[PDB]
Amino acid sequence: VLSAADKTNVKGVFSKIGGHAEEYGAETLERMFIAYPQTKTYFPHFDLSHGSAQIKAHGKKVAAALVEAVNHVDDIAGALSKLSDLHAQKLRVDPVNFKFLGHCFLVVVAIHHPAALTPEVHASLDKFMCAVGAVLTAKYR
Amino acid sequence: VLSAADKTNVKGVFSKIGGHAEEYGAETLERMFIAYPQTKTYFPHFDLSHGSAQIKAHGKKVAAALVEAVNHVDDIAGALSKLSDLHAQKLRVDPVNFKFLGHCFLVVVAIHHPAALTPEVHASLDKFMCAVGAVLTAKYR
Amino acid sequence: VHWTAEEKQLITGLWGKVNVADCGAEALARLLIVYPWTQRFFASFGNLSSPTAILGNPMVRAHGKKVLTSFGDAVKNLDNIKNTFAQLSELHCDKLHVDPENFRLLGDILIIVLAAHFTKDFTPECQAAWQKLVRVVAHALARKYH
Amino acid sequence: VHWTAEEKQLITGLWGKVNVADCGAEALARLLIVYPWTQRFFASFGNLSSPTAILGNPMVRAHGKKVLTSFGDAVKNLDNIKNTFAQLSELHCDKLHVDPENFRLLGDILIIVLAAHFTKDFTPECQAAWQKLVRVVAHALARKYH
Ligand code: HEM
Numbered sequence: 001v002l003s004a005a006d007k008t009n010v011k012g013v014f015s016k017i018g019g020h021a022e023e024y025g026a027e028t029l030e031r032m033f034i035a036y037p038q039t040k041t042y043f044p045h046f047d048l049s050h051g052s053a054q055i056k057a058h059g060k061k062v063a064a065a066l067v068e069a070v071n072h073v074d075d076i077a078g079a080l081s082k083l084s085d086l087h088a089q090k091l092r093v094d095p096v097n098f099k100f101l102g103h104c105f106l107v108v109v110a111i112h113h114p115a116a117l118t119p120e121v122h123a124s125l126d127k128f129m130c131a132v133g134a135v136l137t138a139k140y141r
Numbered sequence: 142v143l144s145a146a147d148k149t150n151v152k153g154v155f156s157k158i159g160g161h162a163e164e165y166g167a168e169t170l171e172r173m174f175i176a177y178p179q180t181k182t183y184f185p186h187f188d189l190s191h192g193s194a195q196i197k198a199h200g201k202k203v204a205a206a207l208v209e210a211v212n213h214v215d216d217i218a219g220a221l222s223k224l225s226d227l228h229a230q231k232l233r234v235d236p237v238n239f240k241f242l243g244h245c246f247l248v249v250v251a252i253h254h255p256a257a258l259t260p261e262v263h264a265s266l267d268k269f270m271c272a273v274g275a276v277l278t279a280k281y282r
Numbered sequence: 283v284h285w286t287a288e289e290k291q292l293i294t295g296l297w298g299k300v301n302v303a304d305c306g307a308e309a310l311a312r313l314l315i316v317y318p319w320t321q322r323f324f325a326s327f328g329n330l331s332s333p334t335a336i337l338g339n340p341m342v343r344a345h346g347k348k349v350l351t352s353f354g355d356a357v358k359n360l361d362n363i364k365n366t367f368a369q370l371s372e373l374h375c376d377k378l379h380v381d382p383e384n385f386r387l388l389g390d391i392l393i394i395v396l397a398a399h400f401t402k403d404f405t406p407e408c409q410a411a412w413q414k415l416v417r418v419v420a421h422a423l424a425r426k427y428h
Numbered sequence: 429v430h431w432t433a434e435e436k437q438l439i440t441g442l443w444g445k446v447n448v449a450d451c452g453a454e455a456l457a458r459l460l461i462v463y464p465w466t467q468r469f470f471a472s473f474g475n476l477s478s479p480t481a482i483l484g485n486p487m488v489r490a491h492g493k494k495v496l497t498s499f500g501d502a503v504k505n506l507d508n509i510k511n512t513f514a515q516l517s518e519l520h521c522d523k524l525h526v527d528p529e530n531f532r533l534l535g536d537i538l539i540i541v542l543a544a545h546f547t548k549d550f551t552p553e554c555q556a557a558w559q560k561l562v563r564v565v566a567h568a569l570a571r572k573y574h
Pocket residue numbers: 039042043061062065066083086087091093097098101132133136
């Protein structure tokens with residue numbers, strides 16, 4: 001999992017993201033749907049047109065959960081426990097889809113905050129998204 | 142990671158393996174080298190002919206480390222700490238190779254102890270090999 | 283892909299001995315148990331609630347059989363797998379959107395099931411030939427993605 | 429693979445603006461830093477001991493450039509990538525035994541590097557076209573495996 005250096009780095013990038021977490025949430029989803037159209041299948045009941053209220057509302061929630069995990073980096077399985085049941089037990093999201101979303105998020109960060117995403121911070125943020133990925137696909141039995 | 146049920150299941154299968162861990166060690170490697178010949182590249186200085194003493198000696202050590210991890214299932218990162226530095230820092234083994242070996246081990250178990258490898262035990266043993274895999278590829282920076 | 287005379291012998295020789303209902307049912311049941319996200323694709327199969335229910339689900343049994351019998355189409359003509367599996371590629375890729383990694387996982391499970399049934403006779407060489415076959419079949423299934 | 433008129437425009441239009449020394453160096457450096465097992469392949473490049481040493485290693489810089497300039501060969505003829513990358517496929521598969529998953533990882537990194545350089549102009553559609561290209565290039569590189 002995450003070293004003290006990694007946790008510093010992740011707190012570092014998320015501080016810069018700050019007030020924009022909601023917009024970045026929406027932007028990450030829009031890029032995921034466009035770049036990996038197979039993800040659209042998990043949202044059949046969504047309006048997936050660009051800048052739809054449904055994407056913005058959902059994006060805000062995804063970003064909010066990421067912020068919450070950052071604020072509880074030492075125990076993310078606890079911070080995201082309710083979300084693991086939803087993603088692993090109920091929705092049964094294929095693990096591969098968490099890699100697509102993690103990658104689109106890193107793309108969004110790079111666009112808006114290129115100077116903050118140094119190679120070192122990149123490596124830490126990737127580990128973090130991987131850690132979140134594994135928690136949300138956990139309780140599979 | 143591992144539930145109490147998983148730990149019971151892994152202890153369960155490894156008890157049956159018991160005195161044969163060394164032979165199964167050797168057999169797993171032989172199947173890996175044959176089924177995934179690209180793994181041979183990590184052992185250029187080995188005699189990889191069937192039933193070579195070098196494979197048997199190495200197989201014993203691999204099996205021994207698995208047994209040790211089982212005996213310390215609650216803290217495997219600690220049990221295998223020296224091995225993570227070797228595999229991740231020094232040898233820089235591509236993660237994919239741990240999946241190949243984990244799969245060949247499960248094949249060896251199924252051959253010798255088919256009644257012990259129930260679907261449930263299968264699921265637990267797979268998680269376990271995945272857990273060992275992640276520990277041995279950890280300290281990458 | 284090139285197949286050796288020995289690989290062909292190992293494949294066709296084991297195929298004649300394979301119980302496709304039994305190995306098929308077990309392979310698909312282990313897929314749903316060991317990799318539980320795969321259950322999403324089979325939601326219409328009814329009760330998938332526990333390992334025992336999955337194991338004794340009739341539609342699981344019957345589908346597992348059909349999966350394994352379609353390996354015979356590959357065995358029949360090993361040099362023409364790409365074309366033989368073109369329709370099933372369209373089905374899995376364009377309709378179902380099953381990520382290719384899952385083809386690999388079912389192949390790996392099939393090999394474990396074969397090993398448990400044939401034990402001693404499932405030599406390293408026989409394993410390697412069978413591993414190559416599930417890899418080739420997986421790749422043929424993923425061709426409508428490229 | 430079929431390319432749309434828009435995809436071709438997004439690719440060729442961005443290619444003319446790309447600094448291949450700078451993006452190339454950064455992409456390969458981030459590969460070695462974020463996925464440290466990839467360093468094994470580049471042991472002969474000298475000091476790979478820390479992120480800063482990796483970043484300021486000259487052979488890393490120069491190789492990264494060569495990786496990215498070979499994307500121009502793809503851009504030149506988008507409908508003939510499979511054949512254009514046949515020799516490099518042989519190199520990576522038969523000589524180096526680089527597992528295909530690593531081609532995907534370098535592609536994903538290249539996209540992040542492009543995003544950081546072009547920011548605003550790196551629209552969702554431009555990303556998608558570039559993602560498709562690295563996927564196609566990765567698949568062309570992995571063809572000697574099948
Ligand atoms: C970092 C990874 C992810 C995080 C933090 C996350 C977070 C969330 C949150 C906060 C919710 C809403 C729960 C609620 O409204 O109470 C949700 C629901 C949902 N997620 Fe995710 N998610 C992630 C990844 C994914 C991925 C990769 C997919 C599929 C491609 C996915 C599919 C869904 C679906 C279909 C819903 C329910 C939507 C609805 O009908 O309201 N999630 N997730």
